[PDB]
């Protein structure tokens, strides 16, 4: 029933997902994760993207009890949004110089990999070919 | 840092409790008797610390002696103190020993046949 | 019981002690007469009208198709020695006893053999003649095959024998058809290509143009030129050493033919070269818009070569398609989604206006509306997207203005051709798409929100009532790549007629409608949008 | 032991989105290639900031959540669903990749009220009532910045003018 | 050198000139793609740009 | 064995990422039907031919330092 | 409070739960809309392990299910969902 | 229990039926080499692929069987192996009941590319086309034990047995299943005088590729 009325509750969750406190963040992430699974494939991806825009920056949290509230949200958004956009977000930092920045990006990538293992195959970019190997997957650029 | 001992395992509990030096002064391959205490570590101890004993004995049953190995493994489970999980662990250990000691299990056929039958 | 009126209208209703549920349809504009026939052991209704139709139940489906034959005056069921089970139709001064062996099907096939893998069509409205291309990697050309056979014979004649010379001559003179021996493993890059121009009325190949053992073909079009006259000019693409895996092409060319013989020939006017393998062509306001590699160039009539009237090298990875809107060109990249660029004629500049977000491996596209364009993918999905309503075509990492996918979902096969057309005169035109597994398909838009909600509830109920026999969930096998949106899975929404009776009654009561009423509602869409 | 900020920025074919801190990674070319995605979304601005994006501007001065008019404008029978599910306004927020920054929120026609306050009367039926800025346009000529603008009296006829519309742009 | 966003993290001279040169107007977005092909022959010759054909047809 | 095979971690090399990419991108080629009947039309080979080619390419594709 | 699981080869053994731990899923730990039934491995129903709760680890009173928010996420397709860790191992009080 | 490398990467695996109905063993079919290997006290047996004589392709390509099949007679078990070209070979076997001795192959016929072949009883073989129409052929002749050259693995050589492709002799296409796949392009239009626009679909694959006008009606 959330698909019938989900755009009117988006700002109410966005204002709570802001940098307000350390306990008002798990609640918004849980609301998003329990609404995405409920509006799975019903045609409400717009508001889901609106909420994900805010839910993504909260990934950088050192609270051991506050990461799971965002990790579950990401694991729900991967399975209710499709890796074509979640991996698109998570691709920019897959090799970031920070040792504590890849620790979260690789974890989110693993969480988005076991789910939709072959679904994300037609979602990666065209890794250009270096002179030391054959990186480009030229076996998918046919015209037939 | 294994857990506490128990009076029911006093058959071979002289390794971590007494000065049972099998390598200092003892018969040949007496350390296999301490392996029975290691079997206690498989029974009394942690899950990984218990499975490590079986994983080590799997690569050491061929260099332990079939006679003493059987004489120490069969009475360990023949006693009435073999609990359900203890019985399962003893069965797994005997199966691993048989898979390691294939031809060596022939002379001990009169033992297990008298133990596994009841 | 079915009654047809004077016109093409005819109404059929189930039988009962009193009148029951009834529906109507046109088969029309002619005297709708009815006759009884014996087919498949049961009875069937032959409707004599402007289009002779046959209706009967089969496989739990009320198959109602038109008869592939001319109209007649009367009909009867003839079952005798010459025709144990057939229909004798009395036409205007003639009696034809005919029998059909088709049990269940919607489309009857008329086949025509070919030479290589076809990859494009062309509509010649002046003559209604089709212009197709055939191509295949690791193949041999006609003249190339002849030269190879002659060389093999000359090499075999270098033996001592020379007693077996007649055997070599016979081996070089025989002709084993490709259908019997397949085709030789003609090298790793040895390409074969040809262009054909035929008429669909028969198997009359009006014209054929072969090519060398390395020349290729990947696109064709039949357009006019504002500079030249009204003479229809064909433009065909060709590759040269387009070795794939690893991708290493050598060049490309565009052959301009004058469409000689009024549709049965073609004069080789100019072979305009290019440093990239072309993959598209289309008249952009009276100009050949060819997308070579990652550069879209609008060319005009060239007496010796296609003149680069305009160019734009802002293609993402590879221009594997193009569209012809009235004022914009919705190019279709081969690594990303579509980009609806604008070709300012006053400025004479092709600027990439708006791209998309998802990396859709576009394979086929079609302007479903003035701005909402649909397309297929390379994995099997299908996505129809449109730009926002307020988007001025002068303003502009991604383009200045961006659009989003409207309705996307997994299909099951690559939709090589998603054309917005009417499959049956009488209903609104739907998007008919092909597939890489032979199974054709249709996508019909809704008209009332009530029917939309009803179909959505039916699909949501059947997704838990009838589980897929493969073992995977329905949404996993329908949204395998992208989440479904505004697209009810008709493959499962109509698969309730072959379910358990108790489950059918439960699904009907949960939907607040009778099981027969639910079946009638589910078939109304297929009857108003299909044959 | 790695490429400099200039060598690793010139060897790449798209240094427009190059970052100084990114050149010290384990694979700078790989990171530069991945950052060159078509329409992806980079890391947020809180990568290196140690303020957590909330301690700096901790003094928020704004309402917590303004009640949207999509649902606010027995509880209600013929107006509850007819105002929230019928007279609903679509929330217009960011589209794809507006990743929340630290602040991210702090950074010929005239109106009737201005015409009433300026002392200009309403438009008559068939007469000449120009604004006082139209006399300078009738004396000096049309403005070169907007040649397609039409004014009543000079380019547009007097019977045009309707209400507060004292001008119309006619693009050719 | 014009103030471009790509030259933000740059802090040098020679490097600045190399960026202003290499990142200048490359082959992409050329001079409107000139292809005149004047009617001086009507059957051959199309290399005349937007200015060559103009001067050929003026006189 | 099957703990996390398919993806590396915080300091995964680019080559070791592309190797898993190709090794899990061919399984969607040898198993999926549209992306297997589409490659046998371009290369003009049978299903068994293309499948054996893809299987043999799983030894060390993408350019192996072997 | 990070609970561990067996995650072995899911055999043909159905799940169970205690009188108090029967509603929530063995993994999702929620009482909202159970979707599918949980299972166990071969070392989860063997002698003393016959009919044991997957959460309480004691007596079984029902069948172990998964939450609808945990089955749609393909979480049920993992190994044995038995709640066992270093503390909740076989040799536990 | 058994582990043994192979000289060539075996594309398929076929089981020699063991027990009373012949000995057991693997029937691997690598690139241009069929190797039968019964585990135990039985040596392996390799046999080259009898490619067609006077070919026109790259000779450095070892043809591999693109399909397989079998039948269950009283004691004569067959293997209708479809080579890469389409020449269905009736690869029989002969041994001393304890160790393989030879594998006599022969060009039984030449059908299209076999993606699936069901050599069932009642004299029927289902030649499923990898791309295009499928066939259900009736085995009229005996298939094996004819005047064709019995190619075995005991006869040494130095140069595969280039046998000429014989026409359909040991089989007859009883039925032709009209498989409209794989479709390559479609266009809906009423090119003819029919009020209902037909659907012109270019489909097939190379030589079997063709065009087809689909008319929405009962033929």
Distance in Å, alpha carbon of C311 to nearest chain E alpha carbon: 6
Angle between helices C449-465 and C515-529 (to 10 degrees): 120
Residues 6+ apart with CB under 8 A from D113: none
CB–CB of C414 and F42 under 8 A?
no
Chain D residues lying within 8 Å of E18, measured CB to CB? 10
The answer, yes or no, to whether B and G have at least 3 beta-carbon pairs within 8 Å is yes
Which pair of tokens denotes residue C172? 């070089």
**How many domains does the structure of chain F reveal?**
1
Q: C354-355 and C401-402 as β-strands: parallel, antiparallel, unpaired? A: parallel
Which DSSP category does H21 fall into? S
Report how far residue H140's alpha carbon sits from residue H6's, in angstroms, rounded to the nearest whole number: 38
* 3 state DSSP class of G56: coil
Q: Which residue from G29, G47, C313 is spatially nearest to G38, judged by alpha carbons?
A: G29
Q: Name G55's Cβ contacts closer than 8 Å, sequence gap at least 6.
A: G17, G18, G21, G24, G26, G29, G64, G83
Q: At E50, is the secondary structure helix, strand, or coil?
A: coil
Q: Rg of chain G's alpha carbons, rounded to an integer?
A: 12
User: What's C338-399 look like in SS3?
Assistant: EEEEEEECCCCEEECCEECCCCCCCCCEECCCCCCEEEECCCCEEEEEECCCCCCCCCCCCC
User: Three-class SS of residue F11?
Assistant: coil
- Under a CB-based contact definition with an 8 Å cutoff, are residues G66 and G72 in contact? no
Cβ distance C481 to A122 less than 8 Å, yes or no, reads yes
Site of tokens 């802090």: E11
Task: List the single residue in F35, F41, F42 with the smallest CB-CB distance to C379.
Answer: F35
CB contact under 8 A, A102 and F11: yes
A3 at the C interface (CB within 8 A)? no
CB proximity C313 to E under 8 Å: yes
Query: CB within 8 A of C462, min separation 6: which ones?
Result: C492, C493, C495, C496, C507
**CA pair distance E39, C304, nearest whole angstrom:** 12
DSSP string, C51-99: S-EEEEEETTEEEEEEBSS---SEEEEE-SSS-SSEEEEEETTEEEEE-
Query: Cβ of F44 and H9 within 8 Å?
Result: no
Q: Which residue of chain D has the CA closest to C336?
A: D38
- Rounding to the nearest 10 degrees, give the CA dihedral for residues E13, E18, E19, E24: 130
Is residue G27 classed exposed, middle or buried when 0-12, 13-18 and 19+ CB atoms within 10 A define those classes?
Answer: buried
HEC string of C475-489 equals CCCCCCCCCCCCCCC
Question: Which are the contacts of D118, defined by CB distance < 8 A and separation ≥ 6?
Answer: none
Task: Check if the beta carbon of residue H130 is closer than 8 Å to that of residue H116.
Answer: no
Asked if E31 is an interface residue toward chain C (Cβ–Cβ < 8 A), one would say: no
Minimum distance, in Å, between the CA of residue G63 and any CA atom of chain B: 24
With CA atoms as reference, report the closest residue to G73 among A59, A114, A109, A119. A114
**Residue G18 counted as an annotated binding residue:** yes
CA-to-CA distance for D3 and C353, rounded, in angstroms?
37
H73 conformational bin, left if phi > 0, alpha if psi -120 to 50, beta if neither: beta
Residue G35, annotated as binding a ligand: no
Q: Is the Cβ pair C112, H210 closer than 8 Å? A: yes
User: In the structure, do chain A and chain G come into contact, i.e. share 3 or more CB pairs under 8 Å?
Assistant: yes
Q: Which residues of D touch F13 (CB under 8 A)?
A: 26-27
Q: H-type helices in C121-237, by residue range?
A: 142-156, 165-173, 178-181
d(CA D157, CA C23): 61
C-alpha angle with apex C474: A140 to G66, nearest 5 degrees?
115
Q: Which helix (H) or strand (E) is C423 found in, with range?
A: none
Q: How far apart are CA A61 and CA A71, in angstroms?
A: 11
Contact pairs from chain A to chain D, CB under 8 Å: 105
Measured CA to CA, the distance from residue D132 to residue D134 in angstroms comes to 5
CB-based contacts of D149, cutoff 8 Å, min separation 6: D108, D142, D143, D167, D168, D169
B107: three-class secondary structure by DSSP: coil
Chain centroid offset of residue D24 CA: 37
User: Pick from C194, C183, C195: which is nearest to C139 by CA?
Assistant: C183
DSSP state of F46: -
For residues C436 and H182, the answer to whether their CB atoms sit within 8 Å is yes
Say yes or no: F29 contacts chain A, CB-CB below 8 A: yes
> Could you list the residue range(s) of the whole structural domain that residue D8 is in?
1-58
- Cα angle: A46, vertex A51, A56; to 5 degrees: 125
Is D39–C355 a contact, with Cβ atoms under 8 angstroms apart?
A: yes
Residue among A117, A130, A137 minimizing CB distance to F6: A117
B85 contacts G47? CB cut-off 8 A: yes
- Residue numbers followed by a gap, chain G, C–N over 2.5 Å: none
Give CA–CA dist F33/H35, Å, rounded.
29
User: Residues for chain G: how many in total?
Assistant: 93
With contact defined as beta carbons under 8 Å apart, do H109 and H171 qualify? yes
Burial class, C202, CB count within 10 angstroms (exposed 0-12 / middle 13-18 / buried 19+): exposed
- Neighbouring subunits of F (3+ Cβ pairs under 8 A): A, C, D, H
Q: Which domain holds residue F11?
A: 1-65
Whether the CB of G68 is below 8 Å from some CB of chain A: the reply is yes
Angle between helices C165-173 and C142-156 (to 10 degrees): 170
**CA atoms of C343 and C366, how far apart (whole Å):** 18
How far apart CA F62 and CA F19 sit, in angstroms, is: 6
Q: Cβ atoms within 10 A of the Cβ of D40, count?
A: 22
* DSSP per-residue string spanning C471-528: SS-TTTTTSSSS---S---HHHHTTTTTS-HHHHHHHHHHTTS-HHHHHHHHHHHHHH
F13 in contact with chain A, both atoms CB, cutoff 8 A: no
Residue D71, classified by CB atoms within 10 Å of its CB into exposed (0-12), middle (13-18) or buried (19+), is: middle
Cα C399 to Cα C50, C316, C321: the distances in Å are 53, 11, 19
- Within 10 Å of residue H163's Cβ, how many Cβ atoms? 18
Structural biology method used: cryo-EM
Chain D environment of E9 (Cβ under 8 Å): 5, 9, 18-20
Q: In what order do the strands lie in the sheet with C307-312?
A: C288-292, C295-300, C307-312
The three-state DSSP-derived secondary structure of chain D is CCCCCCHHHHCCCCHHHCCCHHHHCCCHHHHHHHHCCCCCCCCCCCCCCCCCCCCCCCCCCCCCCCCCHHHHCCCCCCCCHHHHCCCCCCCCCCCCCCCCCCCCCCCCECCHHHHHHHCCCCCCCCCCCCCCCHHHHHHHCCCCCCCCEECECCCECCCCCECCECCEECCC
Chain A meets chain C (3+ C-beta pairs below 8 A): yes
Which chain D residues have a beta carbon less than 8 Å from that of F16? none
For residue A130, the SS3 value is coil
**Alpha carbons H128 and B56: distance in angstroms, whole number:** 54
Compute the half-sphere exposure of residue A110: CA atoms within 13 Å on the CB side of its CA.
Answer: 15
Strands (E), chain B: none
């Amino acid at each position: 029933m959330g698909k019938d009325y989900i755009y009117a509750v988006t700002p109410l969750l966005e204002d709570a997902l802001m940098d307000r406190d350390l306990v008002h963040r798990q609640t918004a992430s849980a609301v998003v994760q329990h609404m995405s699974l409920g509006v799975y494939g019903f045609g409400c991806e717009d508001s889901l993207n609106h909420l994900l825009n805010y839910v993504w920056p909260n990934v950088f949290e050192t609270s051991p009890h506050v990461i799971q509230a965002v990790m579950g949200a990401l694991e729900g958004l991967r399975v209710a949004i499709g890796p074509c956009r979640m991996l698109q977000y998570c691709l920019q930092g897959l090799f970031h110089p920070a040792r504590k920045v890849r620790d979260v990006y690789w974890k989110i990538y693993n969480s988005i990999y076991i789910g939709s293992q072959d679904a994300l195959i037609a979602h990666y970019p065209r890794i250009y070919n270096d002179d030391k190997n054959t990186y480009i997957r030229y076996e998918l650029d046919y015209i037939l | 840092n294994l857990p506490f001992l128990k009076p029911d395992d006093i058959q071979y509990f002289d390794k971590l409790l007494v000065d049972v030096d099998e390598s200092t002064l003892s018969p040949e391959e007496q350390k296999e008797r301490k392996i029975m205490k290691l079997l206690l570590k498989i029974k009394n101890g942690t899950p990984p610390m218990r499975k490590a004993a079986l994983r080590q004995i799997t690569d050491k049953a061929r260099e332990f002696g079939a006679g003493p190995l059987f004489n120490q493994i069969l009475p360990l489970l023949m006693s009435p103190t073999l609990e359900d999980q203890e019985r399962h662990l003893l069965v797994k250990v005997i199966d691993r020993i048989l898979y390691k000691l294939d031809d060596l299990v022939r002379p001990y056929v009169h033992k297990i046949l008298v133990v596994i039958e009841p | 019981l079915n009654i047809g009126l004077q016109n093409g209208v005819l109404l059929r209703t189930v039988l009962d002690p009193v009148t029951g549920d009834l529906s109507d349809t046109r088969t029309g504009s002619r005297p709708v007469k009815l006759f009884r026939v014996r087919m498949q052991g049961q009875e069937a209704v032959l409707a004599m009208s402007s289009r002779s139709w046959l209706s009967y139940s089969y496989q739990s489906r009320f198959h109602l198709t038109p008869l592939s034959y001319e109209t007649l005056e009367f009909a009867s069921g003839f079952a005798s020695e010459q025709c144990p089970e057939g229909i004798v139709a009395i036409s205007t001064n003639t009696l034809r006893i005919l029998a059909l062996e088709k049990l269940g099907a919607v489309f009857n096939q008329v086949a025509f053999p070919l030479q290589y893998t076809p990859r494009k069509f062309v509509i010649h409205p002046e003559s209604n003649n089709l212009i197709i291309i055939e191509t295949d990697h690791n193949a041999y050309t006609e003249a190339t095959k002849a030269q190879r056979k002659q060389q093999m014979a000359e090499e075999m004649v270098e033996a001592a024998g020379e007693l077996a010379a007649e055997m070599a001559a016979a081996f070089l003179n025989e002709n084993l058809p490709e259908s019997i021996f397949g085709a030789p493993k003609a090298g790793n890059g040895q390409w074969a290509s040809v262009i054909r121009v035929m008429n669909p009325i028969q198997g009359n190949t009006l014209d054929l143009v072969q090519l060398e053992q390395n020349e290729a073909a990947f696109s064709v079009a039949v357009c006019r030129f504002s500079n030249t006259g009204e003479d229809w000019y064909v433009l065909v693409g060709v590759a040269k050493d387009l070795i794939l895996n690893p991708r290493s092409v050598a060049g490309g060319f565009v052959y301009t033919y004058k469409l000689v013989n009024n549709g049965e020939k073609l004069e080789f006017l100019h072979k305009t070269p290019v440093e990239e393998v072309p993959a598209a062509i289309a008249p952009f306001q009276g100009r050949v818009l060819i997308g070579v590699g990652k550069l879209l160039r609008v060319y005009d009539l060239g007496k010796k070569k296609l003149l680069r009237k305009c160019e734009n090298k802002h293609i993402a990875n590879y221009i594997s398609g193009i569209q012809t809107i009235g004022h914009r060109v919705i190019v279709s990249d081969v690594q990303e989604s579509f980009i609806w660029v604008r070709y300012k004629r006053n400025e004479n500049q092709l600027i990439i206006f708006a791209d998309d977000t998802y990396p859709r491996w576009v394979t086929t596209a079609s302007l479903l509306d003035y701005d909402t364009v649909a397309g297929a993918d390379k994995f099997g999905n299908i996505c129809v997207v449109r730009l926002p309503p307020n988007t001025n075509d002068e303003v502009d990492n991604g383009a200045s203005q961006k659009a989003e996918v409207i309705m996307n979902y997994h299909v099951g096969e690559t939709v090589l051709s998603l054309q917005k057309t009417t499959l049956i005169p009488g209903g609104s035109e739907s998007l008919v798409y092909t597939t890489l597994s032979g199974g054709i398909g249709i996508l019909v838009p809704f008209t009332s929100h009530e029917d939309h909600d009803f179909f959505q509830h039916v699909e949501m109920h059947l997704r838990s009532e009838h589980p897929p026999l493969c073992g995977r969930d329905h949404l996993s096998f329908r949204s395998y790549y992208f989440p479904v949106k505004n697209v009810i899975d008709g493959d499962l929404c109509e698969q309730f007629n072959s379910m358990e009776p108790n489950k059918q009654k439960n699904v009907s009561e949960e939907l607040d409608r009778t099981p027969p009423e639910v079946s009638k509602k589910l078939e109304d869409i297929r009857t108003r949008y299909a044959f | 032991n790695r490429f400099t900020v200039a060598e690793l920025k010139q060897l790449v074919a798209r240094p427009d989105v190059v970052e100084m801190h990114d050149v010290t990674a384990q694979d700078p070319k790989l990171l530069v290639h991945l950052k060159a995605t078509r329409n992806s979304v980079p890391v947020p601005r809180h990568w290196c900031f140690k303020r957590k994006y909330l301690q700096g501007k901790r003094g928020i001065e704004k309402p917590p959540f303004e009640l949207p008019d999509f649902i606010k404008r027995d509880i209600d029978y013929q107006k509850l669903h007819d105002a929230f599910f019928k007279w609903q306004t679509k929330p217009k927020l960011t589209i794809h990749g507006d990743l929340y920054y630290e602040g991210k929120e702090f950074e010929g026609d005239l109106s009737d009220e201005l015409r009433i306050s300026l002392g200009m009367p309403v438009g008559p039926n068939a007469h000449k009532v120009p604004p006082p800025w139209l006399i300078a346009m009738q004396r000096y000529g049309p403005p070169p910045s907007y040649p397609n603008l039409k004014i009543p009296g000079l380019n547009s006829p007097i019977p045009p003018l309707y209400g507060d519309v004292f001008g119309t742009n006619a693009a050719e | 050198i014009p103030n471009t966003a790509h030259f933000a993290n740059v802090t040098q001279i020679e490097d600045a000139v190399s960026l202003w040169a290499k990142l200048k107007l490359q082959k992409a977005s050329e001079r409107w793609q000139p292809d005149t092909e004047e009617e001086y022959e009507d059957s051959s010759g199309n290399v005349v740009n937007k200015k060559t054909y103009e001067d050929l047809k003026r006189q | 064995q099957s703990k996390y095979i398919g993806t590396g971690h915080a300091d995964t090399t680019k080559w070791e990422w592309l190797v898993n990419q190709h090794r899990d991108s061919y399984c969607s080629y040898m198993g999926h039907f549209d992306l297997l009947n589409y490659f046998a039309i371009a290369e003009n080979e049978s299903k068994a031919r293309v499948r054996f080619n893809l299987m043999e390419k799983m030894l060390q594709p993408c350019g192996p330092p072997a | 409070p990070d609970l561990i699981f067996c995650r072995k080869q899911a055999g043909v053994a159905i799940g169970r739960l205690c009188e108090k731990c029967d509603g929530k899923c063995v993994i999702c730990d929620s009482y909202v809309r159970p979707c599918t039934l949980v299972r166990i491995c071969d070392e989860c129903n063997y002698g003393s392990y016959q009919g044991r709760c997957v959460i309480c680890g004691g007596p079984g009173v029902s069948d172990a299910y998964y939450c609808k928010e945990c089955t749609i996420q393909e979480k049920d397709r993992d190994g044995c969902p038995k709640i066992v860790n270093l503390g909740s191992s076989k040799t536990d009080l | 229990k058994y582990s043994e490398p192979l000289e060539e990467h075996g594309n398929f695996l076929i089981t020699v039926p063991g027990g009373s109905d012949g000995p057991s063993g693997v029937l691997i079919c690598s690139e241009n080499y069929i190797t039968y290997k019964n585990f135990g006290d039985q040596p392996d047996i390799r046999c080259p692929i009898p490619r067609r004589r006077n070919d026109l392709d790259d000779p450095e390509r070892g043809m591999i069987f693109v399909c397989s099949a079998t039948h269950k007679t009283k004691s004569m078990f067959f293997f209708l192996a479809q080579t890469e070209q389409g020449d269905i070979f009736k690869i029989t076997l002969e041994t001393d009941e304890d160790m393989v001795t030879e594998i006599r192959l022969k060009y039984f016929d030449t059908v299209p590319v076999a993606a699936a072949m069901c050599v069932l009883k009642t004299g029927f073989l289902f030649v499923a086309s990898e791309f295009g129409n499928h066939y259900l052929y009736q085995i009229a002749h005996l298939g094996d034990d004819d005047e064709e050259p019995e190619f075995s693995s005991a006869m040494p050589l130095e140069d595969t047995f280039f046998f000429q492709p014989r026409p359909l002799k040991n089989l007859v296409l009883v039925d032709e299943l009209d498989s409209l796949s794989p479709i390559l392009f479609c266009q809906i239009a009423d090119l003819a005088n029919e009020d209902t626009p037909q659907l012109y679909v270019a489909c097939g694959r190379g030589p079997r590729s063709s065009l087809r006008v689909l008319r929405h009606g009962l033929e």
